[PDB]
Amino acid sequence: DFTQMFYNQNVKQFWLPEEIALNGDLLTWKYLGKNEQDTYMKVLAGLTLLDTEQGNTGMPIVAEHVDGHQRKAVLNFMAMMENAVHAKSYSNIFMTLAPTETINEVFEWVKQNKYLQKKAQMIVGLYKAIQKDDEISLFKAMVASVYLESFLFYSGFYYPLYFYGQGKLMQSGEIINLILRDEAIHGVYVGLLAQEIYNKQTEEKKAELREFAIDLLNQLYENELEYTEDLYDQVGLSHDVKKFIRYNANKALMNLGFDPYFEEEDINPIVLNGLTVEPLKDDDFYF
Amino acid sequence: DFTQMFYNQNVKQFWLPEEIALNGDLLTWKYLGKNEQDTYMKVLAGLTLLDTEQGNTGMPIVAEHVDGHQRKAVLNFMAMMENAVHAKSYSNIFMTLAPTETINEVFEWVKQNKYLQKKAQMIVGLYKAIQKDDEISLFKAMVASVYLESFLFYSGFYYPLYFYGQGKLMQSGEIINLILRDEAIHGVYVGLLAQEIYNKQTEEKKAELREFAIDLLNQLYENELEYTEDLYDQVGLSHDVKKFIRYNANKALMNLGFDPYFEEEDINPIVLNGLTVEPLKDDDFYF
Amino acid sequence: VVLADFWAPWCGPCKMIAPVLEELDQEMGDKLKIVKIDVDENQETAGKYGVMSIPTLLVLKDGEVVETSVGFKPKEALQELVNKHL
Amino acid sequence: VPKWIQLNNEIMIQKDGKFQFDKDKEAVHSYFVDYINQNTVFFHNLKEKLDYLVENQYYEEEFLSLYSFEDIKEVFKTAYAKKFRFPSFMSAFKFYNDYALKTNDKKKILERYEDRISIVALFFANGDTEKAKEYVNLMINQEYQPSTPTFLNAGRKRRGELVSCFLLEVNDSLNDISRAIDISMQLSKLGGGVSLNLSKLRAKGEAIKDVENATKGVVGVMKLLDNAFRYADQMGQRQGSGAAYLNIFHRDINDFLDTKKISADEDVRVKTLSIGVVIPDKFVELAREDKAAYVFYPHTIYKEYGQHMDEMDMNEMYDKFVDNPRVKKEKINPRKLLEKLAMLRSESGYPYIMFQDNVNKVHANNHISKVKFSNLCSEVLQASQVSSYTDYDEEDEIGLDISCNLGSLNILNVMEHKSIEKTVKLATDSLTHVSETTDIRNAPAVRRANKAMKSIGLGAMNLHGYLAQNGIAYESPEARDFANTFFMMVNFYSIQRSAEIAKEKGETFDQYEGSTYATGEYFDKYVSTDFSPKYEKIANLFEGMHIPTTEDWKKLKAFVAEHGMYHSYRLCIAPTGSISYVQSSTASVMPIMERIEERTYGNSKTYYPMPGLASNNWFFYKEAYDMDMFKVVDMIATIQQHIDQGISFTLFLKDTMTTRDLNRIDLYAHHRGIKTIYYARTK
Amino acid sequence: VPKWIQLNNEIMIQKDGKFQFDKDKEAVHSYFVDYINQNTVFFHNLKEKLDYLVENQYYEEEFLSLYSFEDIKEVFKTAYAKKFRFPSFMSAFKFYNDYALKTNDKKKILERYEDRISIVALFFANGDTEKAKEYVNLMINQEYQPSTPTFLNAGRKRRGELVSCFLLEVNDSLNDISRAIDISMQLSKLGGGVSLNLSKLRAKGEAIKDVENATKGVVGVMKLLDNAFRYADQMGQRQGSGAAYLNIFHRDINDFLDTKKISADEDVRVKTLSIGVVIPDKFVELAREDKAAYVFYPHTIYKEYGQHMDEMDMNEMYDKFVDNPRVKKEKINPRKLLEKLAMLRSESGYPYIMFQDNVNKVHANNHISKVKFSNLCSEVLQASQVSSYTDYDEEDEIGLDISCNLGSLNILNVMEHKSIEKTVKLATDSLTHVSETTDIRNAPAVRRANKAMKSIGLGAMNLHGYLAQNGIAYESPEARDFANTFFMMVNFYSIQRSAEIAKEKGETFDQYEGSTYATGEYFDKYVSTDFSPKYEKIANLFEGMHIPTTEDWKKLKAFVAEHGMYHSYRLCIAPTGSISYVQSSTASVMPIMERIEERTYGNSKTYYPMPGLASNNWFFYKEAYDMDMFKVVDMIATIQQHIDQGISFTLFLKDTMTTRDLNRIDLYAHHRGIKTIYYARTK
Ligand SMILES: [Mg+2]
Ligand SMILES: [Mg+2]
Ligand SMILES: [Mn+2]
Ligand SMILES: [Mn+2]
Ligand SMILES: [Mn+2]
Ligand SMILES: [Mn+2]
């Protein structure tokens, strides 16, 4: 009942980072403190890693196991967006704002950062555990994918949105909003596929799947807290970002057909502001 | 040396089925004989069936085994074009020209056809034989992929190009020309990835891979001749189609860095109308 | 019996054959003479023997060319080539 | 497949392990008998042929009118008295495909080789029957080859110009830029290659009449000139080839170089504009010492000093520019820029490296102007003055723009005939005639410099062919000794003929008195150093020929002082890549790229063995890529010391060598006195 | 956000269901008090300000030297005596961001509105104090608005040209094309847009000196012109804008249109070159009967008949061309070409459609030349003669090239003051002064035609604003009646002022005697038809103003016959763009695109309601896209019959309306007498 409308929405949202000129951010970037620039680079690098694996591994593997040519076409399109559009856009931003050495250093930093490695290990592990014709392993990977789309990106998205909302780094911010617009529909779509599998189960099996989903969310959440503190303490925003990731965790759960898990909190209003060829006939020549 | 350049060329060639209005083809379709309509339907179904294998297996399997983030992104983009753009385009052409019952029957016929099946299963067999961390099996699959993209499609493309060059079925011919233009670049790109593997091999292993490629080409070519007579004798075109197959076989070989196999021939004019930085270390300024 | 090697300093395959000829001289140098001629400095001899690529190995017996081998050859293949004429 | 091509295809079919080089003569015989004679229209007599060609707008009636018909008939007879036979199939194929006159439908051949030669000789002589027969003997013996424009268009009505190349000085104004575009299109319409000096153009981000940061730099002018050459591309017969030259101390040097990058966007990328870089000795000094260098904004220098940046001495004015707060500049790394040059040459063959101080240290006409740039082939190094094109209805200050009339000596045929003196003098006379008869109404500066400078280009070719056919390795010291002696004799006889022409006409080139020829500074190394061969093998080649000694050079110096010099420039070695086939000669003084060239003309491959290639001289015909580029630099520097203009020096590199090897070759060329470097060919 | 911008954003904040339109005046007050009054340089007296501006090269000294300081002070007092207040924030923002003079560092503001107006008036008067005060009253009442070049650059040293347009005739030669490129760049550096007629250029595949298939067509010339305009980008502050016009019967018309296709490759596509298509009545006739049409090669026609294709009446010579075997052509489908035009305008808004016979049916100066092409804004329609630019040191044959001396009447303020006559006459005098003081040295034909034809353009703006603020719908017949009366009055007084200037100077425009003004044929419909309002409501709008009658037109015709006419052309309705904000007016005579304009400036979103918009006249301010395009065509044709030149007529199309609807609008415009169609704006 939904794939065709998602197909149409995905293809009509098609974009390339080159459509957005980035030289306009040069001055507002120059004006940020060293702490702010550091957090910003690292945040986008963490996002780049997530999209790299979502494009290389997550979306293609889910596409392989989901039945139906139209469902596969949507998932293939989403995969392309992840690595050919999203992951690449971050390099466009980096190449504009930062010198090569700072770019090299931040990519080295992703490789050695323990929270980023842990979250990649956990998510990619679940993708690679999918067994052919085994719907339960597929469900588990789809939960992981929804958590990546609708929860994990958001510790990263906070900062570009926070600047966009203050009228700073608005070209980079425009790119990020386009990425976010895509991930929102990706999270909903994968969520609907996960619910299909969940709804086939006995009540006993469903109870176990909810346990899996909640245990996984909590494990990812605890790691994301440490990641958030590590990045944002130097810019004074860790508590604010934490509220934002909890907000988005609830959206991820909802995409999976589950009740919200965290209590509602006031999000920084700055971040909220950051969001024919008809031929002629003989009678057209006389009036 | 080449992936970013191909990335650029691929994304700038992006297109969607909806861009070409198909209904005006009915004004020339109605004037074709039964044999012409039959051949066109059968050719179209042949292309559709082969392209589906490439979208579901060929491109995604190569993307899976190739190392490199940028290569995986380009390959993902190509897989997207197969599944999201090409497949929808072929379906659109069919739905415009034939009623539902006729489409189902043509696909039943072509699905049972000996020459279409022989080539489809030969290609798919090589994709299924790729082994993790074995570059020889990957190379063999890449050869199969290049043969599909740059050679096997062309016994089929001949007919739409033949009409397109005569002013018949111009809307569907425009679509086919866009598809063909994508397959050409797909073949060249996968060809470069195959040459990379080939160049890493010993001289004895190279000679062995050359023998594999020529042997495979021979098997496919002999089946193409039979496929060609089966479809085109009823419309009197087989002689010219055979010249077009050999010409495209030579292009496929050149994509794989090999010499042409067949002597140069002229092509039907109607179809033609349709178609190491080392830093200066001082002591180098003194001699 | 003489193995004459027509070579040049810029020829990559000619650099690969050099150690093979040194091993061959150690094993067979009592029955085989090995002669090297640089075709960059000695064009008249290269022209006289029609040598029109490098490395070109000529087996000579008592001044006459009895066998000709073009391109790189491993030691065992050079031993087989020379042993026919010993 | 044609019979001649199939017989030519038998060259590589080796029988008995040897190439069938004798099949090329069979190939040319088959070519003639089966295509050329059959497709050549024949007339009952020469009178009918000349009447038909004049009446059908094939020949100019003016140049044939100075001779009575008996004189023209006897010139043709002495052209056919040689009974010239092409030695290779490719020679005849190239001639009858590129230069032989054909009918308006391009279906029948109107001109033989002996008719093209006769017509060109009659054009050269200009009313002299004996001189026409001398030119006929010169060309039918293939001792001297007029440039492709001259050979193809002499005496023809459907012709462009006889000048092979033009060099334009572009001044720093919109009027001058628009006029430069106009002149570039006009001269490309004439068929000649155009080289433009963009070093006077002010840098990107400069001020236009108190409006600061308004200029697009020289790159906008490159885009304009590129589209001008694309538009005036000789209708598609051959794509319009233009050249842009910029000093390495221009601020836009990186933007100028980025035009040839593959990664460069289409908004900054040029496609028909060859790029050349002018490197003063100051840049090499800065790169050697690793000091950070500065590229300057030309308009700031013009405002501060009143002279353009390329008009001043870089070695003297660099420190003054750097210490001048009013001269805007940006800091660059000269070694990084050299590495960028090397990588650009490796990836695309551009830019043309021109060592300005290597040109001007031995430049005879530095009083007129320093040589600020070269031609499209990086071999025409002449003094030029920029033209100040003013507004409409305002008189323009016309300067000197270089026009180069080219001609090539076949070293093999010149040496085998023992006729260095006569060939050089006749070639000088022919080039003087070409310069005189050439007028260009749409280029005031080119026309003015042609009338005043009277500069000609007498090149040479088949150096490697002559050396290999004489058992001399191109890299051997004997080859350099022969080049030294031969080109010293060529320079001696060119200077002697120029002085004789100045005596006969009573006039020298404009501003001759300030040149080193008048002061005698040009002949210092000739009256001090003896250039006779040091090897007995080389000296035996010049047997029967009078090698100019020190006393002869002193006599020539006195003669030049007394009578002057008619030509400002006489010798320049062009690549001559097209006419080399017809003359059965290796291109330029460059070493051969391939022993047997593989060429595809149609659906058939046509192999061309090198002139005189055989089994006995196979390894003397060493391919240029396998040769040490330092030895080739040594050879060219030996030749260059006897050439007043430049030499089209192409660098033949292997894929194994890096950008550091290319930089080492460039710096060795600069150190050895090489004036210009043409191309970096990679195998 | 700034206080004024924040107050401006309260326009869209709706309270009680109504827009807060009164917040806009608060926005002007906040803008001035917080930004302008703080950042305007204030001097102790006008003398110090004038000395500072002339000394610092902000003003020219020559025009201020014609007045004593007492006269200048009185003029400035007259400007400030009005106490002009901007009624919308966007008006002040536009003036003080674009047209107000700023310091060289752009930090401060040197000119107020009353200062720029005073300087422009002092420039216009040329030494006359009373005339300067009259101009000050005219402009501070906002009755007349000098064009953007004239208003911006009048009396300023750092300027371009006061001329808005340049219409260049390009002859069929390489010299003429090179001169076209040169003149295009030299006029783009002056600021004005340049339009070129390319119909004389021979098509692709034509012969260049008897060699066939040599030309690359007009597309190569468009490439050259596009890169020339890109190079002359006026610092990049305003990109170089240029137009190219081609007759629809030109062979290259399909390739001419193919360059505006989005799918067109970069090897054919032009970006900075707007394109226009000139459609004679013959093409419309051929399309109407659905008979095969022919596009002709211009050079074959020139060879056969000795005249250019666009100098011959195609309605008469089309059959002669078709039955002429020596004229080359290819069959085309005129209806397919019309559909191609419609889809090209739907996709990109190009080309401009010029109905040549509609222009020339009522063209007064057909004896001088027929109107072959229009300007970049597709509203100037003047006689032009091609210039034969010959080779260097040869005298060139200079023709006539058109230039814009533009000025706009504010219909609202003109009719509120009941001063149609005074405003039209003063505007005509100012435009005459602008034309006389224009002396362009690098464009010979432009200068010659400016001196000879003395053509000016007097447009009108705020038509829709006046109609909506007076309770008249734009499509209503009362609006057309008002436009008829108003523009007949404007034409009457423009002709009267031109005749008065001719009488007072003793000279007319060149070749006036052959014009329909001298023969009296122009005044036929004016002495035979009464243009007084037919509606009582409309007639009340003109109360207190003497509407010219048939007898008054007869007296004017007699006066013109006796005394002549100074201007060849007087009236042309420009689009009136960014300067329409400053005058608080709707753009041109076009209907408003949107009731409230949503504009982005920096990081702020600014809203501009059209002037006089409120609750009572909300539905009178109907959006242009909502209007019936046929009734807009009726309105423009009613205006067009009183404008001797054209009108910049932009088509406002809905997304749902197909190419057949656009073609119907185009054919109805052709049928109703519309001369030019500017743009196809699709919503
Ligand atoms: Mg100047
Ligand atoms: Mg002409
Ligand atoms: Mn993503
Ligand atoms: Mn996603
Ligand atoms: Mn496909
Ligand atoms: Mn494909």
PDB file of N, CA and C in Angstrom, chain D residues 311 360 363-372 382-386 399-402 448-449 452-454 509-517 567-569:
ATOM      1  N   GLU D 311      58.692  43.433 -20.124  1.00  0.00           N
ATOM      2  CA  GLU D 311      59.621  44.325 -20.806  1.00  0.00           C
ATOM      3  C   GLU D 311      60.862  44.641 -19.981  1.00  0.00           C
ATOM      4  N   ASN D 360      67.851  35.154 -24.484  1.00  0.00           N
ATOM      5  CA  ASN D 360      68.342  36.522 -24.582  1.00  0.00           C
ATOM      6  C   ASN D 360      69.835  36.652 -24.310  1.00  0.00           C
ATOM      7  N   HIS D 363      70.796  36.255 -27.874  1.00  0.00           N
ATOM      8  CA  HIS D 363      69.893  36.918 -28.804  1.00  0.00           C
ATOM      9  C   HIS D 363      70.594  38.116 -29.430  1.00  0.00           C
ATOM     10  N   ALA D 364      70.598  38.165 -30.762  1.00  0.00           N
ATOM     11  CA  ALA D 364      71.310  39.214 -31.475  1.00  0.00           C
ATOM     12  C   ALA D 364      70.552  40.533 -31.511  1.00  0.00           C
ATOM     13  N   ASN D 365      69.236  40.508 -31.323  1.00  0.00           N
ATOM     14  CA  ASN D 365      68.393  41.691 -31.467  1.00  0.00           C
ATOM     15  C   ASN D 365      67.765  42.102 -30.138  1.00  0.00           C
ATOM     16  N   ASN D 366      68.540  42.035 -29.053  1.00  0.00           N
ATOM     17  CA  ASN D 366      68.038  42.469 -27.756  1.00  0.00           C
ATOM     18  C   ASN D 366      67.786  43.969 -27.706  1.00  0.00           C
ATOM     19  N   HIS D 367      68.462  44.749 -28.551  1.00  0.00           N
ATOM     20  CA  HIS D 367      68.210  46.185 -28.600  1.00  0.00           C
ATOM     21  C   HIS D 367      66.802  46.477 -29.101  1.00  0.00           C
ATOM     22  N   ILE D 368      66.345  45.733 -30.110  1.00  0.00           N
ATOM     23  CA  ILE D 368      64.976  45.889 -30.594  1.00  0.00           C
ATOM     24  C   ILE D 368      63.988  45.501 -29.504  1.00  0.00           C
ATOM     25  N   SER D 369      64.178  44.316 -28.923  1.00  0.00           N
ATOM     26  CA  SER D 369      63.357  43.811 -27.831  1.00  0.00           C
ATOM     27  C   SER D 369      63.912  42.479 -27.350  1.00  0.00           C
ATOM     28  N   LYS D 370      63.676  42.145 -26.088  1.00  0.00           N
ATOM     29  CA  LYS D 370      63.956  40.796 -25.628  1.00  0.00           C
ATOM     30  C   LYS D 370      62.907  39.838 -26.180  1.00  0.00           C
ATOM     31  N   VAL D 371      63.282  38.568 -26.289  1.00  0.00           N
ATOM     32  CA  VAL D 371      62.349  37.541 -26.741  1.00  0.00           C
ATOM     33  C   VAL D 371      61.494  37.137 -25.546  1.00  0.00           C
ATOM     34  N   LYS D 372      60.242  37.588 -25.533  1.00  0.00           N
ATOM     35  CA  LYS D 372      59.368  37.371 -24.391  1.00  0.00           C
ATOM     36  C   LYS D 372      58.530  36.107 -24.503  1.00  0.00           C
ATOM     37  N   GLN D 382      62.079  35.506 -31.531  1.00  0.00           N
ATOM     38  CA  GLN D 382      62.389  36.764 -32.188  1.00  0.00           C
ATOM     39  C   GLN D 382      61.956  37.933 -31.318  1.00  0.00           C
ATOM     40  N   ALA D 383      62.609  39.071 -31.523  1.00  0.00           N
ATOM     41  CA  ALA D 383      62.220  40.292 -30.836  1.00  0.00           C
ATOM     42  C   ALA D 383      60.867  40.773 -31.345  1.00  0.00           C
ATOM     43  N   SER D 384      60.018  41.211 -30.420  1.00  0.00           N
ATOM     44  CA  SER D 384      58.696  41.703 -30.766  1.00  0.00           C
ATOM     45  C   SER D 384      58.370  42.917 -29.911  1.00  0.00           C
ATOM     46  N   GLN D 385      57.598  43.830 -30.489  1.00  0.00           N
ATOM     47  CA  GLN D 385      57.135  45.025 -29.802  1.00  0.00           C
ATOM     48  C   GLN D 385      55.616  45.021 -29.779  1.00  0.00           C
ATOM     49  N   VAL D 386      55.044  45.374 -28.636  1.00  0.00           N
ATOM     50  CA  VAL D 386      53.598  45.333 -28.473  1.00  0.00           C
ATOM     51  C   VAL D 386      52.974  46.514 -29.204  1.00  0.00           C
ATOM     52  N   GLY D 399      53.191  48.049 -33.436  1.00  0.00           N
ATOM     53  CA  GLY D 399      54.466  47.478 -33.067  1.00  0.00           C
ATOM     54  C   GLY D 399      54.907  46.396 -34.028  1.00  0.00           C
ATOM     55  N   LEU D 400      55.731  45.481 -33.528  1.00  0.00           N
ATOM     56  CA  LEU D 400      56.256  44.376 -34.318  1.00  0.00           C
ATOM     57  C   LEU D 400      55.689  43.067 -33.785  1.00  0.00           C
ATOM     58  N   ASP D 401      54.976  42.340 -34.639  1.00  0.00           N
ATOM     59  CA  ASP D 401      54.498  41.002 -34.330  1.00  0.00           C
ATOM     60  C   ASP D 401      55.179  40.011 -35.259  1.00  0.00           C
ATOM     61  N   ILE D 402      55.717  38.950 -34.679  1.00  0.00           N
ATOM     62  CA  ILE D 402      56.619  38.057 -35.395  1.00  0.00           C
ATOM     63  C   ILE D 402      55.856  37.254 -36.437  1.00  0.00           C
ATOM     64  N   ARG D 448      54.030  44.910 -40.539  1.00  0.00           N
ATOM     65  CA  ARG D 448      55.134  45.826 -40.282  1.00  0.00           C
ATOM     66  C   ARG D 448      56.412  45.072 -39.947  1.00  0.00           C
ATOM     67  N   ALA D 449      56.311  44.034 -39.112  1.00  0.00           N
ATOM     68  CA  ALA D 449      57.491  43.259 -38.753  1.00  0.00           C
ATOM     69  C   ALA D 449      57.993  42.422 -39.920  1.00  0.00           C
ATOM     70  N   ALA D 452      59.908  45.041 -42.020  1.00  0.00           N
ATOM     71  CA  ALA D 452      61.086  45.628 -41.389  1.00  0.00           C
ATOM     72  C   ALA D 452      62.117  44.580 -40.981  1.00  0.00           C
ATOM     73  N   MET D 453      61.686  43.550 -40.251  1.00  0.00           N
ATOM     74  CA  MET D 453      62.623  42.572 -39.712  1.00  0.00           C
ATOM     75  C   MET D 453      63.152  41.649 -40.800  1.00  0.00           C
ATOM     76  N   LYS D 454      62.295  41.271 -41.752  1.00  0.00           N
ATOM     77  CA  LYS D 454      62.654  40.337 -42.819  1.00  0.00           C
ATOM     78  C   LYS D 454      63.192  39.025 -42.258  1.00  0.00           C
ATOM     79  N   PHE D 509      67.932  44.781 -42.353  1.00  0.00           N
ATOM     80  CA  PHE D 509      66.710  44.781 -41.564  1.00  0.00           C
ATOM     81  C   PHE D 509      66.709  45.965 -40.604  1.00  0.00           C
ATOM     82  N   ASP D 510      65.509  46.401 -40.228  1.00  0.00           N
ATOM     83  CA  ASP D 510      65.374  47.587 -39.396  1.00  0.00           C
ATOM     84  C   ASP D 510      66.071  47.392 -38.056  1.00  0.00           C
ATOM     85  N   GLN D 511      66.755  48.445 -37.606  1.00  0.00           N
ATOM     86  CA  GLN D 511      67.531  48.425 -36.364  1.00  0.00           C
ATOM     87  C   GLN D 511      68.610  47.346 -36.396  1.00  0.00           C
ATOM     88  N   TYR D 512      69.243  47.172 -37.557  1.00  0.00           N
ATOM     89  CA  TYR D 512      70.364  46.243 -37.645  1.00  0.00           C
ATOM     90  C   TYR D 512      71.598  46.785 -36.937  1.00  0.00           C
ATOM     91  N   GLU D 513      71.783  48.107 -36.948  1.00  0.00           N
ATOM     92  CA  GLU D 513      73.016  48.695 -36.433  1.00  0.00           C
ATOM     93  C   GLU D 513      73.193  48.428 -34.944  1.00  0.00           C
ATOM     94  N   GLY D 514      72.097  48.294 -34.207  1.00  0.00           N
ATOM     95  CA  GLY D 514      72.177  47.974 -32.799  1.00  0.00           C
ATOM     96  C   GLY D 514      72.306  46.506 -32.475  1.00  0.00           C
ATOM     97  N   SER D 515      72.243  45.637 -33.479  1.00  0.00           N
ATOM     98  CA  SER D 515      72.324  44.203 -33.257  1.00  0.00           C
ATOM     99  C   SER D 515      73.775  43.763 -33.099  1.00  0.00           C
ATOM    100  N   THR D 516      73.947  42.558 -32.548  1.00  0.00           N
ATOM    101  CA  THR D 516      75.283  42.006 -32.365  1.00  0.00           C
ATOM    102  C   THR D 516      75.968  41.693 -33.689  1.00  0.00           C
ATOM    103  N   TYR D 517      75.203  41.537 -34.773  1.00  0.00           N
ATOM    104  CA  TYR D 517      75.816  41.364 -36.086  1.00  0.00           C
ATOM    105  C   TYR D 517      76.617  42.596 -36.485  1.00  0.00           C
ATOM    106  N   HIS D 567      68.470  39.756 -42.994  1.00  0.00           N
ATOM    107  CA  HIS D 567      67.510  39.076 -42.138  1.00  0.00           C
ATOM    108  C   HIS D 567      67.901  39.254 -40.679  1.00  0.00           C
ATOM    109  N   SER D 568      66.938  39.669 -39.854  1.00  0.00           N
ATOM    110  CA  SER D 568      67.171  39.712 -38.415  1.00  0.00           C
ATOM    111  C   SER D 568      67.363  38.312 -37.851  1.00  0.00           C
ATOM    112  N   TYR D 569      66.556  37.359 -38.307  1.00  0.00           N
ATOM    113  CA  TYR D 569      66.647  35.968 -37.892  1.00  0.00           C
ATOM    114  C   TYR D 569      66.629  35.087 -39.128  1.00  0.00           C
TER     115      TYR D 569
END
